[PDB]
Amino acid sequence: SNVKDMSLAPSGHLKMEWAKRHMPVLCRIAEEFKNDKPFEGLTIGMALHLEAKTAILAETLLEGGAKIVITGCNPLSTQDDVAAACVEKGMEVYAWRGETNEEYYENLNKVLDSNPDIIIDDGADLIFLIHTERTELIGKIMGGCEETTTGIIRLKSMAEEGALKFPVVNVNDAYTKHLFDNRYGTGQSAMDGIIRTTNLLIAGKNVVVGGYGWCGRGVASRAAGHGANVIITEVNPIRALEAKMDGFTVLKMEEAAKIGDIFVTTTGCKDILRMEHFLLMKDGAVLSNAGHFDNEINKNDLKELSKSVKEARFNIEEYDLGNKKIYLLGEGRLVNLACADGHPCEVMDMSFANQALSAKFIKENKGKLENEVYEIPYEQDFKIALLKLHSMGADIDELSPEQRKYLSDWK
Amino acid sequence: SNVKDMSLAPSGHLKMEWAKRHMPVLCRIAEEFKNDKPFEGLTIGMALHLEAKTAILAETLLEGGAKIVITGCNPLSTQDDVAAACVEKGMEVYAWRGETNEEYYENLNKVLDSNPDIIIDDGADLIFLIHTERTELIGKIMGGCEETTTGIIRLKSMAEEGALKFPVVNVNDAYTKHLFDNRYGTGQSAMDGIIRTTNLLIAGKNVVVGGYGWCGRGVASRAAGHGANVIITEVNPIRALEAKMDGFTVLKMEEAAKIGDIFVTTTGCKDILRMEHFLLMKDGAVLSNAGHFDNEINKNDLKELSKSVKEARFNIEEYDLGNKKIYLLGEGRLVNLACADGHPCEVMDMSFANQALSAKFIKENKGKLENEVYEIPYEQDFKIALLKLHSMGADIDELSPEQRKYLSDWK
Ligand SMILES: NC(=O)c1ccc[n+]([C@@H]2O[C@H](COP(=O)([O-])OP(=O)(O)OC[C@H]3O[C@@H](n4cnc5c(N)ncnc54)[C@H](O)[C@@H]3O)[C@@H](O)[C@H]2O)c1
Ligand SMILES: NC(=O)c1ccc[n+]([C@@H]2O[C@H](COP(=O)([O-])OP(=O)(O)OC[C@H]3O[C@@H](n4cnc5c(N)ncnc54)[C@H](O)[C@@H]3O)[C@@H](O)[C@H]2O)c1
Ligand SMILES: O=c1[nH]cnc2c1ncn2[C@@H]1O[C@H](CO)[C@@H](O)[C@H]1O
Ligand SMILES: O=c1[nH]cnc2c1ncn2[C@@H]1O[C@H](CO)[C@@H](O)[C@H]1O
């Protein structure tokens, strides 16, 4: 087991203590998993953003009988104290903050070295690595679960070509996931990363958000909530029109780059900000990324234009272009996880609840599932949404029998 | 042709002149229909909310070669001057404001008496009456178009039972329809109806919104925009959770009836507010409805509790319950259409663009379509949204081919 500093373990345990007390839906699932022990004898290899709430998810599976081998899905998002606390919990952990690309793929491989039965992934890199380099593990793998939009794109494009070799559950596209995780979760946590790292006033700034899907909406909403003038970029006209009618300025990036004070890319696509955009930017512009991979902002292009790169502050790099400066947060990686604590607890409670139950779904269908992407059933979303609603002290009306009849027969 | 007063026509012509200048997407389609004359020789029977913007759609179809027989789909939403101007334009009009239930169904039948080829309806009343009482018309009918959520519910359950006898295009569920007409359109137009009729200050009121679908969100956001304390009612926990995280109080209607100052029902279901809720309401509570039919508020219950019903102000009825008064706007009909001029022009431009092209789709697919509910293809939404985006002074970026390879390859 390979972690940064085992002496950091107490601080991580405390953070797990705090998180466990604020994830009620997962806490209930855990008690049911403590009995019925669904994962006894199985190995679950996990590649997630290793902080307190992931550690609780891993703990939920461990107490359910599973052996847990886990690594980080991002070189910068791991929290060393939490990882050390995970080893004290009895987990095989290969993760630290700041690992090289070379080291990143070493830790992924070591997780696969444990011969897992279930794969839990965030971005499909663990799943990808199996199909390309480690085909010798496909036999034992019962199935997987994928957390994020970008991972689903790859998995679906794999499945489309017929390259997918074991079932994978689409956890991202569940109603209680992408509607809350991607929107309200990154809405708060991305602004958290920016505010905590920069100590800059959001109000009165031009905040340029690339893309207006679920993540864009969230960031636009919370940035607008803090008094920003929000500008939206898109390639989808239906979604740009939403942004316009939500009160935002819609521009081609070649234009938004001229006036933006803070940039947040949320597209899942590469090269949102490249050479031509950097040359248009104002002195002092601050750059950040909330989409999975670090290639939305072209760092090689930015290094190419620069005469030097200095530390401007913790998690802020200064690129002196000679005539102006541009700041990059968290090396252009997930600004909410590279520069903050990730999504708030109550939102990750729902996402990891779907994750937990999806692993149980994989187990119970050991050999009966197709080599396809499976969608999460609506009742699971209904159950989780209702539990979360109640924990916040709200409730729902219920249709009377007469009302159900009016809505189903046409009289 | 049967209308209230032909002398009112000049006001109708002016209102149509004004709308035509603010419906650019439909204005383009009309010129193509004037050119290609797709409906030459055909009769189109239409049941829509007969105001200035519906008249433009009818005229657009008239210039496309069609004979137009139109009535209102609601007894109160018709504008008499617009109807008069419609007859001066050469349309067969059977509609006036405030028509009785027998008059409403007499006018519905008169439209069908013209033996139409294409049916354009809002709420499935024409399509329903055809299938039940006027079955001899199925032969000549090529197809239909349905405007609203409620109409689609009926049409889908009809088709599910095998009772649908000609194809109907689902105009409501188009992206450029329910995402903007039901949300932004209803958001502004319903609050206009409430504000315009009552002259009451929205800020500081407890506004109880029934339902949190597309119409619910719009009303809630616009009510909040004006400083109301928004309370949401729902039977869908996923959507109730949305409202909670958008900053609203979520309650069962029994608790909400105790504190609500203004009520807006947006459910499409009957009996949202009944006897038991009227007994809980505050003295002076204002009741309003934005769902298609007037049975979301149980008016029979309210009369039974009332010692008298009198005019309190134009479009306001005072129901004196003896110990308190309850006010009802627009006889519990579409508060944005019974008490105002309906959706804003820019929003109906998109909805009526889809209506026009779907009528063209029906004609060109004569005898080829099944007796099923047809969805509007994505390329139609794309074209419409892009056109609408451009007219509002914004534009969209485009992916380079290299960016298009990245989003499709799983490496
Ligand atoms: N904690 C986090 O930081 C977090 C959480 C959830 C998802 N994500 C990642 O964020 C990304 C999107 O999340 P989603 O759920 O919003 O996906 P989504 O697809 O709803 O949002 C994507 C939007 O980007 C737009 N887009 C694509 N290329 C563009 C371009 N070149 N210029 C402008 N706009 C463009 C698309 O039209 C789409 O609207 C994914 O990579 C996902 O993994 C991150
Ligand atoms: N101009 C207008 O006024 C206008 C425009 C569009 C649609 N509409 C009408 O408004 C209604 C809604 O349209 P939509 O597109 O919102 O449909 P939608 O179904 O998305 O919204 C309906 C919501 O009502 C909720 N609901 C149902 N019964 C309920 C109950 N008893 N208590 C609480 N919540 C309940 C459902 O869960 C759903 O979320 C439909 O009747 C539609 O025809 C009116
Ligand atoms: O605090 C967190 N812990 C674990 N996963 C997280 C956290 N915040 C966000 N994500 C998840 O990371 C993915 C993007 O790579 C998203 O799927 C999001 O849900
Ligand atoms: O001003 C208007 N003219 C015509 N139709 C309208 C207007 N406002 C709303 N609707 C339409 O009425 C239906 C609800 O019964 C909805 O489909 C909405 O699009």
Coordinates of N, CA and C in Angstrom, one line a residue, chain B residues 41-223:
Chain B
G41 N -56.2 24.1 -51.5 CA -57.4 23.3 -51.6 C -57.8 22.6 -50.3
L42 N -57.0 22.7 -49.3 CA -57.3 21.9 -48.0 C -58.0 22.8 -47.1
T43 N -58.8 22.2 -46.2 CA -59.5 22.8 -45.1 C -58.8 22.3 -43.8
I44 N -58.5 23.3 -42.9 CA -57.8 23.0 -41.6 C -58.7 23.5 -40.5
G45 N -59.1 22.5 -39.6 CA -59.9 22.8 -38.5 C -59.0 23.0 -37.3
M46 N -59.2 24.2 -36.6 CA -58.3 24.6 -35.5 C -59.1 25.0 -34.3
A47 N -58.6 24.5 -33.1 CA -59.1 24.9 -31.8 C -57.9 25.4 -31.0
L48 N -57.7 26.7 -30.9 CA -56.6 27.3 -30.2 C -57.1 28.5 -29.4
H49 N -56.3 29.0 -28.6 CA -56.6 30.2 -27.8 C -56.6 31.4 -28.8
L50 N -57.8 31.9 -29.2 CA -58.0 32.8 -30.3 C -57.6 34.2 -29.8
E51 N -56.3 34.6 -29.8 CA -55.9 35.9 -29.6 C -55.0 36.3 -30.8
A52 N -54.2 37.4 -30.6 CA -53.5 38.0 -31.7 C -52.5 37.0 -32.3
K53 N -51.8 36.3 -31.5 CA -50.7 35.4 -32.0 C -51.3 34.1 -32.7
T54 N -52.4 33.6 -32.2 CA -53.0 32.5 -32.9 C -53.5 32.9 -34.3
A55 N -54.0 34.1 -34.4 CA -54.5 34.6 -35.7 C -53.4 34.7 -36.7
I56 N -52.1 35.0 -36.3 CA -51.0 35.0 -37.2 C -50.7 33.6 -37.7
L57 N -50.7 32.6 -36.9 CA -50.6 31.2 -37.3 C -51.6 30.8 -38.3
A58 N -52.9 31.1 -38.0 CA -54.0 30.8 -38.9 C -53.8 31.5 -40.3
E59 N -53.4 32.8 -40.2 CA -53.1 33.5 -41.4 C -51.9 32.9 -42.2
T60 N -50.9 32.4 -41.4 CA -49.8 31.8 -42.1 C -50.2 30.5 -42.8
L61 N -51.2 29.8 -42.2 CA -51.7 28.6 -42.9 C -52.7 29.0 -44.0
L62 N -53.4 30.1 -43.9 CA -54.2 30.6 -45.0 C -53.4 31.0 -46.2
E63 N -52.3 31.7 -46.0 CA -51.5 32.1 -47.1 C -50.8 30.8 -47.7
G64 N -50.7 29.7 -46.9 CA -50.2 28.5 -47.4 C -51.2 27.7 -48.3
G65 N -52.4 28.3 -48.5 CA -53.4 27.7 -49.4 C -54.6 27.1 -48.7
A66 N -54.6 27.2 -47.3 CA -55.6 26.5 -46.5 C -56.9 27.3 -46.3
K67 N -58.0 26.6 -46.3 CA -59.2 27.2 -45.7 C -59.2 26.9 -44.2
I68 N -59.6 28.0 -43.5 CA -59.4 28.0 -42.0 C -60.8 28.1 -41.4
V69 N -61.1 27.1 -40.5 CA -62.3 27.1 -39.6 C -61.7 27.0 -38.2
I70 N -61.9 28.0 -37.4 CA -61.2 28.1 -36.1 C -62.2 28.4 -35.0
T71 N -62.1 27.9 -33.9 CA -62.8 28.3 -32.7 C -61.8 28.3 -31.5
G72 N -62.2 28.9 -30.4 CA -61.4 28.9 -29.2 C -61.5 27.6 -28.5
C73 N -60.3 27.2 -27.9 CA -60.2 26.0 -27.0 C -60.5 26.3 -25.6
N74 N -60.9 27.6 -25.2 CA -61.3 28.0 -23.9 C -62.4 29.0 -24.0
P75 N -63.4 28.9 -23.2 CA -64.6 29.9 -23.3 C -64.2 31.3 -23.0
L76 N -63.1 31.5 -22.2 CA -62.7 32.9 -21.8 C -61.5 33.5 -22.5
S77 N -60.7 32.7 -23.2 CA -59.5 33.2 -23.7 C -59.6 33.9 -25.0
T78 N -60.7 33.8 -25.7 CA -60.9 34.4 -27.0 C -60.9 35.9 -26.8
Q79 N -60.3 36.6 -27.8 CA -60.4 38.1 -27.9 C -61.3 38.5 -29.0
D80 N -62.4 39.2 -28.7 CA -63.4 39.4 -29.7 C -62.9 40.3 -30.9
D81 N -62.1 41.3 -30.6 CA -61.6 42.1 -31.7 C -60.8 41.3 -32.7
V82 N -59.9 40.4 -32.1 CA -59.1 39.5 -32.9 C -60.0 38.6 -33.8
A83 N -61.0 38.0 -33.2 CA -61.9 37.1 -33.9 C -62.6 37.9 -35.1
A84 N -63.0 39.1 -34.8 CA -63.6 40.0 -35.9 C -62.6 40.2 -37.0
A85 N -61.4 40.6 -36.6 CA -60.3 40.8 -37.6 C -60.1 39.5 -38.4
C86 N -60.2 38.3 -37.7 CA -60.0 37.1 -38.4 C -61.0 36.8 -39.5
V87 N -62.3 37.2 -39.2 CA -63.3 37.0 -40.3 C -63.1 38.0 -41.4
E88 N -62.7 39.2 -41.1 CA -62.3 40.2 -42.2 C -61.1 39.7 -43.0
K89 N -60.3 38.8 -42.4 CA -59.2 38.2 -43.2 C -59.7 37.0 -44.0
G90 N -60.9 36.6 -43.8 CA -61.4 35.5 -44.6 C -61.5 34.1 -43.9
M91 N -61.5 34.1 -42.6 CA -61.5 32.9 -41.8 C -62.9 32.6 -41.3
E92 N -63.3 31.3 -41.2 CA -64.5 30.9 -40.6 C -64.3 30.8 -39.1
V93 N -64.9 31.8 -38.3 CA -64.7 31.9 -36.9 C -66.0 31.7 -36.1
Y94 N -66.0 30.8 -35.2 CA -67.1 30.6 -34.2 C -66.5 30.7 -32.8
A95 N -66.4 31.9 -32.3 CA -65.7 32.1 -31.0 C -66.1 33.5 -30.5
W96 N -66.3 33.5 -29.2 CA -66.5 34.8 -28.4 C -66.0 34.6 -27.0
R97 N -65.7 35.7 -26.3 CA -65.3 35.6 -24.9 C -66.6 35.3 -24.0
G98 N -66.4 34.4 -23.1 CA -67.5 34.1 -22.2 C -68.6 33.2 -22.6
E99 N -68.3 32.4 -23.6 CA -69.3 31.5 -24.1 C -69.6 30.3 -23.1
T100 N -70.9 30.0 -23.1 CA -71.3 28.9 -22.2 C -70.7 27.5 -22.7
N101 N -70.9 26.5 -21.8 CA -70.4 25.2 -22.2 C -71.1 24.6 -23.4
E102 N -72.5 24.8 -23.5 CA -73.2 24.4 -24.7 C -72.7 25.1 -25.9
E103 N -72.5 26.5 -25.7 CA -72.0 27.2 -26.9 C -70.6 26.8 -27.3
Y104 N -69.7 26.4 -26.3 CA -68.4 26.0 -26.6 C -68.4 24.7 -27.4
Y105 N -69.3 23.7 -27.1 CA -69.4 22.5 -27.8 C -70.2 22.6 -29.1
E106 N -71.0 23.6 -29.2 CA -71.7 23.9 -30.5 C -70.6 24.5 -31.5
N107 N -69.8 25.4 -31.0 CA -68.7 25.9 -31.9 C -67.7 24.9 -32.3
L108 N -67.4 24.0 -31.3 CA -66.5 22.9 -31.7 C -67.0 22.1 -32.8
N109 N -68.3 21.7 -32.7 CA -68.9 20.9 -33.8 C -69.0 21.7 -35.1
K110 N -69.3 23.0 -35.1 CA -69.4 23.7 -36.3 C -68.1 23.7 -37.1
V111 N -66.9 23.7 -36.4 CA -65.6 23.6 -37.0 C -65.5 22.3 -37.8
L112 N -66.0 21.2 -37.2 CA -65.9 19.9 -37.8 C -66.9 19.8 -38.9
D113 N -68.0 20.5 -38.9 CA -68.9 20.5 -40.0 C -68.3 20.8 -41.3
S114 N -67.2 21.5 -41.3 CA -66.5 21.9 -42.6 C -65.7 20.7 -43.2
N115 N -65.8 19.5 -42.6 CA -65.1 18.3 -43.0 C -63.6 18.6 -43.2
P116 N -62.9 18.9 -42.1 CA -61.5 19.3 -42.3 C -60.6 18.1 -42.7
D117 N -59.4 18.5 -43.3 CA -58.4 17.5 -43.7 C -57.3 17.4 -42.6
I118 N -57.0 18.6 -42.0 CA -56.0 18.6 -40.9 C -56.6 19.3 -39.7
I119 N -56.3 18.7 -38.5 CA -56.8 19.2 -37.3 C -55.7 19.7 -36.5
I120 N -55.8 21.0 -36.0 CA -54.8 21.6 -35.1 C -55.6 21.9 -33.8
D121 N -55.2 21.3 -32.7 CA -55.9 21.4 -31.5 C -55.0 21.6 -30.3
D122 N -55.6 22.2 -29.2 CA -54.9 22.5 -28.0 C -55.7 22.0 -26.8
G123 N -55.4 20.8 -26.4 CA -56.1 20.1 -25.3 C -56.9 18.9 -25.7
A124 N -56.9 18.5 -27.0 CA -57.4 17.3 -27.5 C -59.0 17.3 -27.6
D125 N -59.6 18.4 -27.3 CA -61.1 18.5 -27.4 C -61.6 18.1 -28.8
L126 N -61.1 18.8 -29.8 CA -61.5 18.4 -31.2 C -61.2 17.0 -31.5
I127 N -60.0 16.5 -31.2 CA -59.6 15.1 -31.4 C -60.5 14.2 -30.6
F128 N -60.8 14.5 -29.4 CA -61.7 13.7 -28.6 C -63.1 13.7 -29.2
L129 N -63.7 14.9 -29.4 CA -65.1 14.9 -29.9 C -65.2 14.2 -31.3
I130 N -64.2 14.2 -32.1 CA -64.2 13.5 -33.4 C -64.3 12.0 -33.1
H131 N -63.5 11.5 -32.2 CA -63.5 10.1 -32.0 C -64.8 9.5 -31.3
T132 N -65.5 10.4 -30.6 CA -66.6 10.0 -29.8 C -68.0 10.2 -30.5
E133 N -68.2 11.4 -30.9 CA -69.5 11.8 -31.5 C -69.5 11.9 -33.0
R134 N -68.4 12.4 -33.6 CA -68.4 12.7 -35.0 C -67.4 11.7 -35.7
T135 N -67.7 10.4 -35.5 CA -66.8 9.4 -36.1 C -66.7 9.4 -37.6
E136 N -67.7 9.9 -38.3 CA -67.8 9.8 -39.7 C -66.7 10.7 -40.4
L137 N -66.0 11.5 -39.7 CA -65.0 12.4 -40.2 C -63.6 11.8 -40.3
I138 N -63.4 10.6 -39.7 CA -62.0 10.0 -39.7 C -61.4 9.8 -41.1
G139 N -62.3 9.5 -42.0 CA -61.8 9.2 -43.4 C -61.0 10.3 -44.0
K140 N -61.6 11.5 -44.0 CA -61.0 12.6 -44.7 C -59.8 13.2 -43.9
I141 N -59.7 12.9 -42.6 CA -58.7 13.5 -41.8 C -57.3 12.9 -42.1
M142 N -56.4 13.7 -42.5 CA -55.0 13.2 -42.7 C -54.2 13.0 -41.5
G143 N -54.4 14.0 -40.5 CA -53.7 14.0 -39.3 C -54.0 15.2 -38.5
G144 N -53.3 15.3 -37.3 CA -53.5 16.3 -36.4 C -52.3 16.8 -35.7
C145 N -52.4 17.9 -34.9 CA -51.3 18.4 -34.1 C -51.9 18.8 -32.7
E146 N -51.2 18.4 -31.7 CA -51.6 18.8 -30.3 C -50.6 19.7 -29.7
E147 N -51.1 20.7 -29.0 CA -50.3 21.8 -28.5 C -49.8 21.6 -27.1
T148 N -50.6 21.0 -26.2 CA -50.4 21.1 -24.8 C -50.0 19.7 -24.1
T149 N -49.5 19.8 -22.9 CA -49.2 18.6 -22.1 C -50.4 17.8 -21.9
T150 N -51.5 18.5 -21.5 CA -52.8 17.7 -21.2 C -53.3 17.0 -22.4
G151 N -53.3 17.7 -23.6 CA -53.7 17.0 -24.8 C -52.9 15.8 -25.1
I152 N -51.6 15.9 -24.9 CA -50.7 14.7 -25.2 C -51.0 13.6 -24.3
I153 N -51.3 13.9 -23.0 CA -51.7 12.8 -22.1 C -52.9 12.0 -22.6
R154 N -53.9 12.7 -23.0 CA -55.1 12.1 -23.5 C -54.8 11.3 -24.8
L155 N -54.1 11.9 -25.7 CA -53.8 11.3 -27.0 C -53.0 10.1 -26.8
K156 N -52.0 10.1 -25.9 CA -51.1 8.9 -25.7 C -51.9 7.7 -25.1
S157 N -52.8 8.0 -24.1 CA -53.6 6.9 -23.5 C -54.7 6.5 -24.5
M158 N -55.2 7.3 -25.3 CA -56.0 6.9 -26.4 C -55.3 5.9 -27.3
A159 N -54.1 6.3 -27.8 CA -53.3 5.5 -28.7 C -52.9 4.2 -28.0
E160 N -52.7 4.3 -26.7 CA -52.3 3.1 -25.9 C -53.4 2.0 -26.0
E161 N -54.7 2.5 -25.9 CA -55.8 1.6 -26.0 C -56.2 1.3 -27.4
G162 N -55.5 1.8 -28.4 CA -55.8 1.5 -29.8 C -57.1 2.3 -30.3
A163 N -57.4 3.4 -29.6 CA -58.6 4.2 -29.9 C -58.2 5.3 -30.9
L164 N -56.9 5.6 -31.1 CA -56.5 6.7 -32.0 C -56.7 6.2 -33.4
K165 N -57.3 7.0 -34.2 CA -57.7 6.6 -35.6 C -57.0 7.5 -36.7
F166 N -56.2 8.5 -36.3 CA -55.3 9.1 -37.3 C -54.1 9.7 -36.5
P167 N -53.0 9.8 -37.2 CA -51.8 10.3 -36.5 C -51.9 11.7 -35.9
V168 N -51.2 11.9 -34.8 CA -51.2 13.3 -34.2 C -49.8 13.6 -33.9
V169 N -49.3 14.8 -34.3 CA -47.9 15.2 -34.0 C -47.9 15.8 -32.6
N170 N -46.9 15.4 -31.8 CA -46.7 15.9 -30.4 C -45.9 17.2 -30.5
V171 N -46.6 18.3 -30.6 CA -45.9 19.6 -30.6 C -45.4 20.0 -29.3
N172 N -46.1 19.7 -28.2 CA -45.7 20.2 -26.9 C -44.3 19.7 -26.5
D173 N -44.1 18.4 -26.7 CA -42.9 17.7 -26.2 C -41.6 18.1 -27.0
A174 N -41.7 19.0 -28.0 CA -40.6 19.5 -28.7 C -39.7 20.3 -27.8
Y175 N -38.4 20.3 -28.0 CA -37.5 21.0 -27.2 C -37.8 22.5 -27.3
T176 N -38.0 23.1 -28.5 CA -38.3 24.5 -28.6 C -39.7 24.8 -28.2
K177 N -40.4 23.9 -27.6 CA -41.8 24.2 -27.1 C -41.8 24.1 -25.6
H178 N -41.8 22.9 -25.0 CA -42.0 22.8 -23.6 C -40.9 23.4 -22.8
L179 N -39.7 23.5 -23.4 CA -38.6 24.1 -22.6 C -38.7 25.6 -22.5
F180 N -39.5 26.3 -23.4 CA -39.6 27.7 -23.4 C -41.0 28.2 -23.3
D181 N -42.0 27.6 -24.0 CA -43.4 28.0 -23.9 C -43.9 27.7 -22.5
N182 N -43.7 26.4 -22.1 CA -44.3 26.0 -20.8 C -43.6 26.6 -19.6
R183 N -42.3 26.9 -19.8 CA -41.5 27.4 -18.6 C -41.4 29.0 -18.6
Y184 N -40.7 29.6 -19.6 CA -40.5 31.0 -19.6 C -41.8 31.7 -20.0
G185 N -42.5 31.1 -21.0 CA -43.8 31.7 -21.4 C -44.8 31.8 -20.3
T186 N -45.1 30.7 -19.7 CA -46.1 30.7 -18.6 C -45.6 31.4 -17.4
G187 N -44.3 31.4 -17.1 CA -43.7 32.2 -16.0 C -44.1 33.6 -16.0
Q188 N -43.9 34.3 -17.2 CA -44.2 35.7 -17.3 C -45.6 36.0 -17.5
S189 N -46.3 35.2 -18.3 CA -47.7 35.5 -18.7 C -48.7 35.3 -17.5
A190 N -48.5 34.3 -16.7 CA -49.3 34.0 -15.6 C -49.2 35.1 -14.5
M191 N -47.9 35.5 -14.2 CA -47.7 36.6 -13.3 C -48.3 37.9 -13.8
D192 N -48.2 38.1 -15.1 CA -48.8 39.3 -15.7 C -50.3 39.2 -15.4
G193 N -51.0 38.1 -15.6 CA -52.4 38.0 -15.3 C -52.8 38.3 -13.9
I194 N -52.0 37.8 -13.0 CA -52.2 38.0 -11.5 C -52.0 39.5 -11.2
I195 N -50.8 40.0 -11.6 CA -50.5 41.4 -11.3 C -51.5 42.3 -11.9
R196 N -51.7 42.1 -13.2 CA -52.6 43.0 -14.0 C -54.0 43.1 -13.4
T197 N -54.6 41.9 -13.0 CA -56.0 41.9 -12.6 C -56.1 42.4 -11.1
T198 N -55.1 42.1 -10.3 CA -55.3 42.3 -8.9 C -54.6 43.6 -8.4
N199 N -53.6 44.1 -9.1 CA -52.9 45.3 -8.7 C -52.3 45.1 -7.2
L200 N -52.0 43.8 -6.9 CA -51.5 43.5 -5.6 C -49.9 43.3 -5.7
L201 N -49.3 43.6 -4.6 CA -47.8 43.5 -4.6 C -47.4 42.1 -4.4
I202 N -46.6 41.6 -5.3 CA -46.2 40.2 -5.2 C -45.1 40.1 -4.1
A203 N -44.2 41.1 -4.0 CA -43.1 41.0 -3.0 C -43.7 40.9 -1.6
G204 N -43.2 40.0 -0.9 CA -43.6 39.7 0.5 C -44.8 38.8 0.6
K205 N -45.4 38.4 -0.5 CA -46.5 37.4 -0.5 C -45.9 36.0 -0.4
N206 N -46.7 35.1 0.3 CA -46.5 33.7 0.2 C -47.3 33.2 -1.1
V207 N -46.5 32.8 -2.1 CA -47.1 32.4 -3.3 C -47.0 30.8 -3.4
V208 N -48.1 30.1 -3.3 CA -48.1 28.7 -3.4 C -48.4 28.2 -4.8
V209 N -47.4 27.5 -5.3 CA -47.4 27.0 -6.7 C -47.7 25.5 -6.7
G210 N -48.8 25.1 -7.3 CA -49.1 23.7 -7.4 C -48.4 23.0 -8.5
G211 N -47.5 22.1 -8.2 CA -46.8 21.4 -9.2 C -45.4 22.1 -9.5
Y212 N -44.5 21.4 -10.0 CA -43.1 21.9 -10.3 C -42.6 21.2 -11.5
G213 N -43.5 21.0 -12.5 CA -43.0 20.7 -13.9 C -42.5 22.0 -14.6
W214 N -42.6 22.0 -15.9 CA -42.1 23.2 -16.6 C -42.9 24.4 -16.3
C215 N -44.2 24.3 -16.3 CA -45.0 25.5 -15.9 C -44.8 26.0 -14.5
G216 N -44.7 25.0 -13.6 CA -44.4 25.4 -12.2 C -43.1 26.1 -12.0
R217 N -42.0 25.6 -12.5 CA -40.7 26.3 -12.5 C -40.8 27.7 -13.0
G218 N -41.4 28.0 -14.1 CA -41.6 29.3 -14.7 C -42.3 30.3 -13.7
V219 N -43.4 29.9 -13.2 CA -44.2 30.7 -12.3 C -43.4 30.9 -11.0
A220 N -42.8 29.9 -10.4 CA -42.0 30.0 -9.2 C -40.8 31.0 -9.4
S221 N -40.1 30.9 -10.5 CA -38.9 31.8 -10.7 C -39.4 33.2 -10.9
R222 N -40.4 33.4 -11.7 CA -40.9 34.8 -11.9 C -41.5 35.4 -10.6
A223 N -42.2 34.6 -9.9 CA -42.8 35.0 -8.6 C -41.6 35.4 -7.6

